[PDB]
Design a protein around this nucleic acid. Structure first.
Ligand SMILES: Nc1ccn([C@@H]2O[C@H](COP(=O)(O)OP(=O)(O)OP(=O)(O)O)[C@@H](O)[C@H]2O)c(=O)n1
Ligand SMILES: [Mg+2]
Ligand SMILES: [Mg+2]
Ligand SMILES: [Zn+2]
Ligand SMILES: [Zn+2]
Length: 621
RNA sequence: ACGAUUAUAUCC
RNA sequence: GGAUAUAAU
């Protein structure tokens, strides 16, 4: 029922080309685990990825009360080995979403058409240039070379400056213009990030899919305009937040909460990219209806031949050593495509609008839309669609919706039938809604209204303190380190004083870390540094300069631009709120840690060696 | 060898 | 503008 039906007239040449370069080892394993993906063959390969973690000695030594807290100490780097990847693959990528019902599809298509038109009122699809690509791509961006003709260069920078790289692009750009595709294949790797381990094992996290550099240009050429012209900015899309930094997102939530409506809902979707249906992809492609000429053909080539027909190359442990599987999947979002963020935001705006529609009873059944319901839907979009859009903040899969009323919480038949099944809740269990916008999660944070001593008001980002301390105590790599990650620890402290200055433990811990890290060191990478013989790196005073720059000078929501003169003027959350968000104030282990903080600082100093040190601790009493 | 999109800090 | 670091989807 759920097996994948490949279109070999479209993906056929790609698979043959991969096979041709690997005839020595190409077989057809009949023990392949793929249940929902078409499988095409395997061949020998070598293991890539990692599952180890390095300890950040300076931060661990300075956060002792948290040694006894498993929400801190179980933090690890993810497992990006093929073992780690196949786990994630069996858990979430190797799944199938049921085709939505005919009423759902009519609802999605109507809404997507109205959305593309609203997004396009003040923007125009356009091609992007090779010069634009050459200026944007990082010099060390992955080449991701699939075939040997593509493995000539040592960096993306070198590749983009060779006319031979652009000859490969031209060969394939010409195929796309005829409607054929021969080289656009996805690499696959696991996302390296920080995730809580369980049972002494580091966990995988997610799949990252990337085509080779030439195919990524071709993506960019046809579809980069969604990003480069900022289609999903809040100004253009009403719901998006593209371009707004994390720290300013609380200001958007406060404005959404000014609206009249029900609770504030922020239902996460479980494995959003794996739940993108071919219906979703075909509604996304409707942007080509606003294109012309050569552009329309290149976009359509990308959507049809590379997004709706993906050939993937993924590693897999097998008792005879690691192999590489050549699989294929017509739906899903390939997390790594140029459209990932933007089209995730698009479809998630479309899904939330529909859920709002269900809540208001515009339509009543997803099995079929009556003509009078199609009329009601279109007239609803015309009448209120733009206002319903502004009741949302949507950053790809992450969303906050303040609906008209709380019928939303139990309006789940369209949401579930589109595949957008909520995380950590039953299919038909009503949603949990916040009636206080400062408690709403959005992009892994919530936001507090912080009154300053002037009486001015900041909105500041905040999360459970154990997540922050956990992440600061580990890094990529292996084993233990002290000197090699001291500047990294100072980097974390700088983040803490700028974004979470309002948490007592974090502001104490940050000053302690700065007091312990040699003050003339400057990071040149995660594990390397240089010594400015006469400049101190990021003293107290220029940390306070950064704080005033971000929260006052450049803060559009701060009218009075009067600087703050002293770290002691910069306030904290109220104690109860600090505690509610994981503060250890009130615990005796923390009062001890604090009272004796200079001892631990002097201990780290001695372990690092004889260097010049500065005491950031008098910034607080 | 190291995805896309984006913010901030730093260094050049 | 680039690189690094961090963070977010
Ligand atoms: N490093 C990342 C993280 C996320 N995303 C995109 O943003 C979507 C939503 O991100 P998130 O909600 O953090 O992950 P999910 O895939 O939803 O996984 P889960 O919610 O199960 O943690 C992902 O599906 C992915 O397509 C991405 O491109 N790159
Ligand atoms: Mg999700
Ligand atoms: Mg989130
Ligand atoms: Zn192609
Ligand atoms: Zn908080």
């Amino acid at each position: 029922i759920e097996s994948e039906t490949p279109n070999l007239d479209i993906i056929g040449k790609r698979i043959e080309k991969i096979k041709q370069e690997h005839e020595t080892s190409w077989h057809y394993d009949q023990d392949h685990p793929y249940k929902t993906w078409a499988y095409h063959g395997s061949y020998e390969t070598k293991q890539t990825g990692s599952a180890s973690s390095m300890v950040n000695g300076v931060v661990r030594l300075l956060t002792k009360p948290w040694d006894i807290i498993p929400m801190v100490t179980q933090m690890a780097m993810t497992d990006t080995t093929p073992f780690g990847q196949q786990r994630v693959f069996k858990e979430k990528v190797d799944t199938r979403t049921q085709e939505p019902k005919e009423g759902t599809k009519k609802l999605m298509k109507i809404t997507a058409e109205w959305l593309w038109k609203e997004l396009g009122k003040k923007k125009t699809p356009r091609m992007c240039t090779r010069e634009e690509f050459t200026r944007k791509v990082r010099s060390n961006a992955a080449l991701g070379a699939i075939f040997t003709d593509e493995n000539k260069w040592k960096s993306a920078r070198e590749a983009v400056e060779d006319s031979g790289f652009w000859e490969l692009v031209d060969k394939e750009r010409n195929l796309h213009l005829e409607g054929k595709c021969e080289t656009c294949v996805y690499n696959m790797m696991g996302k390296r990030e920080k995730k809580l381990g369980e049972f002494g094992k580091a966990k995988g996290s997610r799949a990252i899919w990337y085509m080779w550099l030439g195919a990524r240009f071709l993506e960019f050429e046809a579809l980069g305009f969604l990003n480069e012209d900022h289609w999903f900015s809040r100004e253009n899309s009403l719901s998006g937040v593209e371009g707004e930094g994390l720290h300013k997102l609380g200001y958007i939530l406060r404005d959404v909460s000014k609206k009249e409506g029900g609770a504030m809902y922020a239902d996460d979707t479980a494995g959003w990219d794996t739940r993108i249906t071919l219906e979703d992809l075909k509604n996304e492609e409707m942007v080509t209806n606003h294109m012309e000429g050569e552009h329309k053909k290149l976009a359509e080539a990308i959507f049809k031949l590379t997004y709706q027909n993906k050939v993937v190359r993924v590693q897999r442990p097998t008792p005879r050593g690691t192999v590489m599987d050549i699989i294929s999947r017509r739906d899903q979002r390939g997390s790594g495509q140029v459209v990932t963020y933007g089209l995730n935001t698009f479809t998630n705006m479309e899904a939330q609008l529909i859920r709002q529609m269900e809540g208001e009873g515009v339509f009543k059944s997803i099995q079929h839309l009556t003509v009078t319901e199609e009329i009601a839907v279109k007239n609803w979009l015309v009448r209120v669609g733009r206002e319903r859009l502004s009741r949302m903040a949507i950053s790809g899969d992450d969303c906050v919706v303040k609906p008209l009323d709380d019928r939303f919480a139990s309006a789940l038949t369209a949401l579930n039938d589109m595949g957008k099944v909520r995380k950590d809740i039953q299919q038909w269990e009503p949603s949990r809604g916040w009636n206080d916008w400062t408690q709403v999660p959005f992009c892994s944070h919530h936001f507090h209204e912080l009154i300053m001593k002037d009486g001015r008001v900041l909105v500041v980002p905040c999360r459970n303190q154990d997540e922050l301390i956990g992440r600061a105590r580990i890094s990529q790599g292996a084993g233990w380190s002290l000197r090699e990650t001291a500047c990294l620890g100072k980097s974390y402290a700088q983040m803490w004083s700028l974004m979470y200055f309002h948490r007592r433990d974090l502001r104490l811990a940050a000053n302690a870390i700065c007091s312990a890290v040699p003050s003339h060191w400057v990071p040149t990478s995660r594990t390397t540094w240089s010594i400015h013989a006469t400049h101190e790196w990021m003293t107290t005073e220029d940390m306070l300069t950064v704080w005033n720059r971000v929260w006052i000078q450049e803060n559009p929501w701060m009218e009075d631009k009067t600087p703050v003169e002293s770290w002691e003027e910069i306030p904290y959350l109220g104690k109860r709120e600090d505690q509610w968000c994981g503060s250890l104030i009130g615990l005796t282990s923390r009062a001890t840690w604090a009272k004796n903080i200079q001892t631990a600082i002097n201990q780290v100093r001695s372990l690092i060696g004889n260097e010049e040190y500065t005491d950031y601790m008098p910034s607080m009493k």
